[PDB]
Automatic annotation (TrEMBL), chains A, B:
One of its GO terms (biological process) is chitin biosynthetic process. It is found in: Cell membrane. It is a multi-pass membrane protein. One of its GO terms (molecular function) is chitin synthase activity. Signal peptide: none annotated. InterPro entries: Chitin_synth (IPR004835), Chitin_synth_N (IPR013616), Nucleotide-diphossugar_trans (IPR029044). The keyword Protein biosynthesis does not apply. The chain crosses the membrane at residues 439-458, 470-494, 514-533, 545-569, 596-615, 718-738, 758-782. Its EC number is 2.4.1.16. This is chitin synthase. It comes from the Eukaryota. Keywords: Cell membrane, Cell wall biogenesis/degradation, Glycosyltransferase, Membrane, Transferase, Transmembrane, Transmembrane helix. It comes from Candida albicans (strain SC5314 / ATCC MYA-2876).
Amino acid sequence: AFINDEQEYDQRIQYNQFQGDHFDLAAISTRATGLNGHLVLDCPVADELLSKFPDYNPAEKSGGLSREFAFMRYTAVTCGPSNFYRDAYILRPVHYPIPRQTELMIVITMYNEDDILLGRTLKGVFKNIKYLESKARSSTWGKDSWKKIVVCIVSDGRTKINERAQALLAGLGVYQEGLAKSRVDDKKVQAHMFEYTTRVGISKVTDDVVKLTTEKVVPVQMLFCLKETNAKKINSHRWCFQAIGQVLDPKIVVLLDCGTQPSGRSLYELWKEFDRDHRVAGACGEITTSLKKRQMITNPLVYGQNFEYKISNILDKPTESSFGFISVLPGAFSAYRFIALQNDINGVGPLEKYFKGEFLHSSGELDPNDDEFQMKHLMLKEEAGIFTSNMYLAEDRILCFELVAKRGCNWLLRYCKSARAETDVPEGLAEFILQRRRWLNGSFFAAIYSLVHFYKVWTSSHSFGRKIFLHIEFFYQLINLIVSWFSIGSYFLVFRILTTSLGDKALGFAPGKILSVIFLWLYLASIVTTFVLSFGNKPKGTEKFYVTIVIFFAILMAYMIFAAIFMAVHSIQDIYRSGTRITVSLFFQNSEFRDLVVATSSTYALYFLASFLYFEPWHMFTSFVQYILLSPSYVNVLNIYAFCNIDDISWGTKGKSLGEAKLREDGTFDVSVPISKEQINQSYLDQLEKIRDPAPPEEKVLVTNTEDYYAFIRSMTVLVWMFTNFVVIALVLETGGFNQFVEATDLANLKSNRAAVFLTVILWTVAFMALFRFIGCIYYLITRLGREIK
Amino acid sequence: AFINDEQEYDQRIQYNQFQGDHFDLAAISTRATGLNGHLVLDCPVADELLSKFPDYNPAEKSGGLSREFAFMRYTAVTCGPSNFYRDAYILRPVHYPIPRQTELMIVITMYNEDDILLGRTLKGVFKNIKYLESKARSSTWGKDSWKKIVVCIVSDGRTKINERAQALLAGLGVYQEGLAKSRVDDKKVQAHMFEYTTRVGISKVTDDVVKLTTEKVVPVQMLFCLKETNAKKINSHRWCFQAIGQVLDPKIVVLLDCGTQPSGRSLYELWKEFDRDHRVAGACGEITTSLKKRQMITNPLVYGQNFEYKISNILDKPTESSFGFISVLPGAFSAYRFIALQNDINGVGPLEKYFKGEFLHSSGELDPNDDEFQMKHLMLKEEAGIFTSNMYLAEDRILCFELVAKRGCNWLLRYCKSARAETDVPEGLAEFILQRRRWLNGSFFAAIYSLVHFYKVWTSSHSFGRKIFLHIEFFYQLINLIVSWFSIGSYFLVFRILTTSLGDKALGFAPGKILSVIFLWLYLASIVTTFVLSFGNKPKGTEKFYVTIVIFFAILMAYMIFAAIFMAVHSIQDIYRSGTRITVSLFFQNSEFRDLVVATSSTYALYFLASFLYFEPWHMFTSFVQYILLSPSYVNVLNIYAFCNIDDISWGTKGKSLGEAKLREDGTFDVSVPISKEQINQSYLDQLEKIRDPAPPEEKVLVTNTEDYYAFIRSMTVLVWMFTNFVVIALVLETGGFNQFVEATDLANLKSNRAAVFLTVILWTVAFMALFRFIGCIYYLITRLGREIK
Ligand SMILES: NC(=O)OC[C@H](O)[C@@H](O)[C@H](N)C(=O)N[C@H](C(=O)O)[C@H]1O[C@@H](n2cc(C(=O)O)c(=O)[nH]c2=O)[C@H](O)[C@@H]1O
Ligand SMILES: NC(=O)OC[C@H](O)[C@@H](O)[C@H](N)C(=O)N[C@H](C(=O)O)[C@H]1O[C@@H](n2cc(C(=O)O)c(=O)[nH]c2=O)[C@H](O)[C@@H]1O
């Protein structure tokens, strides 16, 4: 088990002086005393782990190590997040005789993750801490910087945690099996907290095994909170913020996910972003997809995702940062300023909005024995509107808006490209669909919520010009939402127009008509099957259907590209053949050539230039084709699955022995049955009286279950979506009954004109959005360079 | 509580001599002895019930009543249906010193039914038994006929039974609360059986209360089997046939349902049908809908159901009886010959086929403690095909086929119109949809299964002509299935053709075009919403949507009728105006008039004549219009809901405390944690070794759950249905890409010709099916009259 930039850090660190601070222990005789009447145990760590440490001396009983390095602390938390601070629950960092002030709380979220992912994340975090320690000419960082950093690992579900990751944590010395206790004082233990200052560092993380060593390892404070039962990720974040954060009172809480490996200096970059400008309340960093042992052709999906991530980080994030409002801060890698998230005295704030989703989106079955029964009952008893009861879709996204549009605060969200983190994307199609479900639902709901409540920014204490530019950004987001809502209909219309144009006898393409008919039938069949499967079955089961649909859509996209190129070439040849003193004006006056070629070429050129200016050009070559061929799948399959499954009904449905006859030694059975005549007569009379009366009306008027409400919401949403898309399609191609209001010959020309108008509208909308994002990213680069010079 | 044809019965019955047979009791001291090592208790009934009986004498300790009338018997059954006969479980009728042979077992099925429905059913059964007792010149029936009849009430679910019906049963004296025991000898009690010969008769059953009296009441043997847990209706029938039937070994098992009130002589009619012809193995009787306190206009649905029931009993049942094979025998009121249902020595038979559905259609989670674990495990381990694993859809329907097409037996199914039973239909729309779901699914699956396996009748020992006529019936059923599969597409095509025909400028109707467009849009919206709701929500929740859709479809049907009449009148006027020596030949040569008018009028006339000949003409006037206006709803809404919900997933998903720390008198907490250095080091080494190894491949290859299989089957079914219907629609109206292969002017004429051909085909298919059924019912009447004369 035990065996260039990194090297630099090691030279600056002395590594000889790492004596820990003394703290009071808990007596463990096996009666054990608990601090403040809580179950707390300071157990000794395995002697081998102590022996590994350089400072260890065989003669000394504990090796001469400090109290913190010698003993690991275990606490049983029964109250839960809401009352954790109210009760006298004390964490070790704040229990020292000299209080320690936290500067950076690195939260890590875990759920049945392999030990490899956790090892990678911990290696990244340890490298960042080592870099911070090595920093010499820093006012805040340097010697004894590890005391200001706490790493919190919140594992969701005691029985769902992977055994190998748990073994990894045990190897670090944080966790021990015997300590954990199910109940204390007849009270269920909601969480188990293990605290230890580990001096064990992961040397390397191969594909199959993890190697940890004690050589050149900086001590790290580790708090491992294992939850008794799984309550999703919102509950984990409630533990992180509502309970642990209040006790620690940190700054710049960093949120990480297992499998996300930050760079060697990424966390320093995030901290510096927060430090330079005091108005910044949230920050995000570049997220990359690993392509180590994945081929270009064998894994089209991975490379398509790589292209999507690169384009996002190059165009979307910089523009939103320039405007000061970022729609989404990735939960896998982000950072928030703790004070900015605090609620107001009235009790309304970003954290309240974020947490309300968990309580509202759940079965209305509250256990009376829970100590948070009063809070949950009061929240559920409150009248909730559409937005409040559907907050669960937005998730972290809501926070961003609530931070920017505060009542009287001046907060901004910023994106830094210096911070980089690498994560593993889902290779399988089913996992990819499942991941995109919640991403799409959250994006849509957050956009709708922000646009509806755009007026809340009026009262915020921002400069007038800042408000004007925020309104410009809101207008852009409204246009983007409108475009995204009509994506499926626009795709179908473009496909139909391009395929039917090849059927025209003017151009010399014989199979065009038959191919168009066949493709139409296949397209309809694929859409219908996608809807049926999205409602009926699970993606993991019927994966082959989705694979076939994706392949067909890729082939169709290739055919559409070929058709567009053929049409443009034919239009140019028609420009030439006749002979009209050919000039650039005529080329730009031809609707076909202009719309089909110029707009798409301009969009591609803008993407190419944006990639080049950021010194990240490879993705434009290696991964462009895969993304282009998968685009229709993104619009059709993922969107249909997401909208069909807006409701996430995780909870199931709903939720005195008469006697016991035991055979005795003899054949007789011991029974207790009525014997006296009096009781038999009384029971008979009671039955007579029970049936002797008419039936009263039920009039239950029960509240009923919330699953029906969410299912109704989802059904209404999908129906409205279908209706609007079909209205647009019928208006463009004269598909419904509209054809009756025209004649045999007028219909063709009218349909052609409408199709041309629609094509030019959609293509130029896309091109102008691309230009807007390009200008945004150029401004981001210029301002960041100027700031760096300053 | 205690207060003309019927009168006749009372005059023939003496009522003075009703002494019961003596039987051995079980000692009840409170140690009680159980017969054959089973938990059996013979308790005394309430003294007031004994006092009511005329024969009661105050001086006598028990009133001089017989042992059976004095004591009620309670038995606890732990084994279950499969092993009930193998174990020494003895029922009281067979326990007499002189064995009693059962002639008619009247099974009644109950599930949380109101005491009113049970009271009505019991009143009907008691009246039938009284009539059988009164019969004088009968070889089998007459004095002491009540000894040959046993009434079995199988209640599904101990905690789901309604309290008022249970109180009714207690009032009869069958049930007592104290006796029931949950466990015996550490074995769960699957069923609780209460046996009593009750002399209490329900005098009248008002709307709100039930009145029972002891005057002029014939004793009735009652066996009330209360099941511990609900296992649906197939398990109840398994209890009735597999377990109770074997012990009783009865003939002509009668199946009834709560709320079904047979007539005064209906059961005698069924028994006589079985007795006259020995080849008969199953029989069914006329089922009627009560219209006592229900108005014509206030309850369209009830009257529509009345018309449907009357037409079924007048046309479908008689024809199928004449052919000797009835597709469905109503489970609410039917009768079967017990010997015919017995399986073969090889173990294959109608009952095995019927029961396999319960075991196959359930979660694959078998409790090892069940005594039927071996049987269920063997059945599930067996390789099951599509038909075997989907038997659950057919339900009782399967039995009929398996009875007719036996390997070497000669059995027939017969329908008798002398037997009548009245039942309450679901007034609500949601309940009606839920009821029709399983009816439609069973009808479709049974038709498919019978048609695929039509060859099995070759080996049956039937006359050659009988086999020929059975093949003719199979051909008719194939045509009916084909027509029913394309119902929705045919309805849409007819609607579209009729609405568009009004748009023609030849006829003088201005709003036609706009109305057709609006109706098309509304029709599409209704179909799409029906699909979405059928997949997403429950009928009870979103009932208003279904109500609105039904109302719209009724309005559309009225408009279609108006359009057809207008078109026919216009065609006749065109025949006349020009002047062509008008004759009947020209009227019959005009496609419009002929198809639209003659076919529909002929169908209506056939229905009218069939109703008149059966002396049941009122339904053709009172309830015809409601059925006509609801027809499209039947085809669209019910069929869509049934196909979307083929899978009936009733079962849910899926299905060691670390320690306990108790605070002592002192502040210390009592805990058990590792102390010795050795064990700590050993645990650390174990964790190191656990993580020190590479991850082995899962390779689970698990069978997985059956819910996915059924969902997949349902999705495939709906997809195939949609595809076939759309292919037909596209072929008829040139709706898809077919229009591209024609020109501006040819499309109109070609579409018109295809529409005319389709209309004539469908209308004449319906008319010929009606004529076939009419001839069938006439033959049934003639043969029944001839038989009656004989
Ligand atoms: N830009 C971007 O986000 O990419 C990142 C990458 O693609 C993501 O997949 C990344 N691995 C990721 O974050 N996955 C999960 C998630 O996103 O929800 C994270 O939540 C944790 N989790 C999941 C639960 C569940 O699955 O039900 C649960 O019940 N409770 C709980 O705590 C889980 O341990 C993981 O850390
Ligand atoms: N021609 C025609 O059939 O019309 C008859 C009329 O319209 C029907 O409604 C009639 N009342 C009827 O039979 N209803 C039920 C059914 O049909 O299944 C019957 O089954 C019994 N039942 C239902 C269960 C459930 O509901 O889940 C269950 O779980 N276990 C169980 O034993 C229930 O006590 C009733 O007796």
